Amino acid sequence: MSEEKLQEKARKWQQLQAKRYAEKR
Amino acid sequence: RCSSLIMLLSGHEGEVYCCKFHPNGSTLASAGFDRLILLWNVYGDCDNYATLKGHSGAVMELHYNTDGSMLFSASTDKTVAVWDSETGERVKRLKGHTSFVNSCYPARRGPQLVCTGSDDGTVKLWDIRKKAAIQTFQNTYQVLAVTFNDTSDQIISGGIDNDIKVWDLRQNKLTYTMRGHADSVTGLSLSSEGSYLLSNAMDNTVRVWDVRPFAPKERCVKIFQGNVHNFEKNLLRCSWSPDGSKIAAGSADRFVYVWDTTSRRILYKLPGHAGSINEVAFHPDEPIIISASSDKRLYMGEIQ
Known part of the structure; x- marks a missing residue:
C-alpha cells in the first residue's frame, strides 16, 4: 500500500504483539 | 470411512x-x-x-x-x-x-x-x-x-x-x-510437489501463487473467498493436501475451511470449534484433517 499506512500499520502491530504476547500475559 | 482411525483432542491448556x-x-x-x-x-x-x-x-x-x-x-x-x-x-x-x-x-x-x-x-x-x-x-x-x-x-x-x-x-x-493483498499476510504453505504456494491474509481472501522459475508474470492464479479475519488478529495459517488437490486456510469464524484447488469452491466448512481457527493440517497418507483453534481443542476428522 502506501508508506505511512505501512508504518502506522506496523506501529499498530508492534503495539499489538508487544502486549498480547507480553511476558505478563 | 476411508481411513484407519470426528474424535476430539483435549489437553491443550490454552490456545493452539x-x-x-x-x-x-x-x-x-x-x-x-x-x-x-x-x-x-x-x-x-x-x-x-x-x-x-x-x-x-x-x-x-x-x-x-x-x-x-x-x-x-x-x-x-x-x-x-x-x-x-x-x-x-x-x-x-x-x-x-x-x-x-x-x-x-x-x-x-x-x-x-x-x-x-x-x-x-x-x-x-x-x-x-x-x-x-x-x-x-x-x-x-x-x-x-x-x-x-x-x-x-x-x-x-x-x-x-x-x-x-x-x-x-x-x-x-x-x-x-x-x-x-490488501492487509497482513499471515500464513504461507507450499505443496509437496513444490510448485504452488498458499497465502492467507486479513483481506479475508486466500491466494494460490506458483513459486517456480517458469514465470507467468502475474503469479496470482487462483483467488479463494469464504475466509474471514477478525478483531483477534491471529496468525491464520494454511496447508496443502499431500495429493495437492485441496487447500485449507484457517479462518476466524470457527469453521474449518477446505477448498478444492481446481473447482475453487469450498468443499468442507466444518463446525465444532468455538474460537478463531489458527492452523488446519492434512494427514500425509489418509484423508484426515486436524484443526487447531483458540478453543483449546483439536478436531481430527475423516474428510473423505
Whole structure:
C-alpha cells in the first residue's frame, strides 16, 4: 500500500504483539 | 470411512496456534499458547504420549521435516527450538531474532536449514551446525509467515507489508514482490510437489501463487473467498493436501475451511470449534484433517 499506512500499520502491530504476547500475559 | 482411525483432542491448556502431522502419519504435534508442545498418536485411542517443554513463550509455528525425526518450533519469546520426536528433548535453541518469531520452515531436501521470520523484520536462516545466523534478509516491516521452496534455495516470507516477498539465497536480494493483498499476510504453505504456494491474509481472501522459475508474470492464479479475519488478529495459517488437490486456510469464524484447488469452491466448512481457527493440517497418507483453534481443542476428522 502506501508508506505511512505501512508504518502506522506496523506501529499498530508492534503495539499489538508487544502486549498480547507480553511476558505478563 | 476411508481411513484407519470426528474424535476430539483435549489437553491443550490454552490456545493452539499451530498443528502439524508427522510425515509418516502415525504421530502428531500440536502447540500454541501453552508454551508446551503436545505429541499425540494419530490412530488408536489418540493419547498424548510425549510433551515438549522448553519454550518460555507461546509457540507460533510447528513444522516437521520430511524425515520427521526433528521438530522445528518458532516461539513468541525470541527463539526457535529444534526438538527430536522419539524421546523428546530439545536438541537445539536458535537465538538470533530480536523480537517475536512468527514463523519457521524446514529445508527438507538438502541440508537442514530453518528459515525463520520475526517481528523485527529480519528473515533469518539457520543451519543447525552453525549455531548462528547465516543470512538475514532485512524486511522493513513484520513478517508473519516464511517458507522455503522445493529447492530450499529461496525463502518466501509473507508479512504485514501487503506483499509476499521471495528472497534468493544466492542473490541475497528480493527478486520479485507478489502484490495483490490488501492487509497482513499471515500464513504461507507450499505443496509437496513444490510448485504452488498458499497465502492467507486479513483481506479475508486466500491466494494460490506458483513459486517456480517458469514465470507467468502475474503469479496470482487462483483467488479463494469464504475466509474471514477478525478483531483477534491471529496468525491464520494454511496447508496443502499431500495429493495437492485441496487447500485449507484457517479462518476466524470457527469453521474449518477446505477448498478444492481446481473447482475453487469450498468443499468442507466444518463446525465444532468455538474460537478463531489458527492452523488446519492434512494427514500425509489418509484423508484426515486436524484443526487447531483458540478453543483449546483439536478436531481430527475423516474428510473423505
